[PDB]
């Protein structure tokens, strides 16, 4: 956060009336937009995989992007970076991970594990602000989910509710 003054840090943390302060760490706005642009590139590239089998899906730019963003999320979800990931959960990261789960043979040809990753994201340090948005996202019924995605959403709501007792 590199705040200019100790008193500016103190005022900024006292400004939220709930007595929980600001996040300890935060992404600067150009870095934030770079992170979001990688997911929007993936969302525009979805048209390039609509017809094809896993063996050539593994040879697409869409998959190379997706496999990189999987390794980025998976490394961000360890150690001191989990807080950097909670701002991207309901808009980009969770939508991306349920997206990957449709491609179960791609997750077998490349040794990816969207299931273990997404279920494990229920245990991250999520703020009171983000709990309500996480709850409205997981409580959104879309008929577009297959059983694997809806039972993954229940698995999340299992490791989330138990981690929100």
């Amino acid at each position: 956060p590199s705040i200019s003054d100790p008193t500016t840090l103190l005022e900024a943390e006292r400004n939220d009336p709930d007595g929980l302060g600001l996040p300890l760490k935060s992404v600067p706005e150009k870095v934030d937009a770079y992170i979001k642009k990688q997911f929007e590139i993936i969302k525009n590239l979805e048209d390039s995989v609509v017809g094809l089998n896993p063996q050539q899906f593994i040879k697409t730019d869409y998959f190379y992007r997706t496999s990189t963003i999987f390794y980025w999320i998976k490394e961000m979800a360890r150690g001191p970076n989990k807080v950097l990931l909670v701002p991207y959960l309901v808009d980009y990261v969770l939508p991306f991970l349920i997206g990957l789960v449709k491609h179960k043979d791609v997750c077998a040809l490349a040794s990816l594990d969207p299931v273990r990753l997404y279920a494990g994201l229920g245990y991250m340090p999520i703020r009171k602000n983000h709990v309500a948005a996480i709850v409205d996202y997981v409580c959104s019924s879309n008929v577009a989910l297959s059983s694997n995605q809806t039972k993954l959403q229940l698995a999340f709501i299992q490791h989330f509710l138990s981690a929100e007792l």
Partner: protein
């Protein structure tokens, strides 16, 4: 059977976390062993750990072991166990001919090996072998290269290229890019070159650490010497300099 799948918390049955899983851990810690087929050969290659300065090279065992005039075995995991596992396979093959007027088939040398490994898994407070193997060769009166992998549990499978031991992910990744199953290496030289490129990415230092055996039809078994694999390593390193200097900028 592992990780985050857990109903009403969880409790363990008789199941997964078991002696055979710890034998699989021993296999992964043993040196890298690779095999690739070709149009009309099969090459097995191994990692030596870089020999100590006081070690005696002329009597040091060739890591790839001949089981019979047409069958070759290499391993990762426990050396002592592989020595006990090669002895059983060698006498099993010599006994095959003595009782069947037929040299042992590569598929019977793989079902037997994995078969004996499975019996030391099954029961008795006798431990499974900390060993995984490549078994390669030709059947008699045939020109088709064969290559099998066996695992401590006694499971076995056929591969057109495979790798076992240390760092084998990175090697299998390179093989999936460089080995085309429609057009495999059409000549022994290219098959050997592919195994030297494959091993060069994972070995400790260089030509010291690689060693290869080439199997061909009609019992033409042939270990390559240090000097022969030094000219392969040097040719591959020449092509790296050539590719880098053929940068266009």
């Amino acid at each position: 059977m592992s990780g985050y799948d857990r109903a009403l918390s969880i409790f363990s049955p008789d199941g997964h976390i078991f002696q055979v899983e710890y034998a699989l851990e021993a296999v992964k810690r043993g040196t890298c062993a690779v095999g690739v087929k070709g149009k009309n050969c099969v090459v097995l290659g191994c990692e030596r750990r870089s020999t100590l300065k006081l070690q005696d090279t002329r009597i040091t065992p060739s890591k790839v072991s001949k089981i019979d005039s047409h069958v070759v075995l290499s391993f990762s995991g426990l050396n002592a166990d592989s020595r006990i596992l090669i002895e059983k396979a060698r006498v099993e093959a010599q006994s095959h001919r003595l009782t069947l007027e037929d040299p042992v088939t590569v598929e019977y040398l793989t079902r037997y090996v994995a078969g004996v490994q499975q019996r030391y898994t099954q029961s008795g407070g006798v431990r499974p072998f900390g060993v995984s193997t490549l078994i390669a060769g030709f059947d008699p009166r045939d020109d088709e290269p064969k290559l099998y992998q066996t695992e401590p549990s006694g499971i076995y499978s056929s591969w057109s290229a495979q790798t076992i031991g240390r760092n084998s992910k990175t090697v299998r990744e390179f093989l999936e890019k460089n080995y085309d199953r429609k057009e495999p290496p059409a000549t022994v030289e290219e098959c050997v070159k592919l195994t030297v490129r494959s091993l060069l990415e994972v070995v400790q230092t260089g030509a010291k650490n690689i060693e290869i055996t080439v199997v061909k039809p009609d019992s033409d078994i042939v270990a390559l010497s240090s000097e022969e694999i030094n000219q392969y390593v040097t040719q591959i390193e020449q092509e790296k300099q050539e590719q880098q200097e053929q940068d266009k900028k």
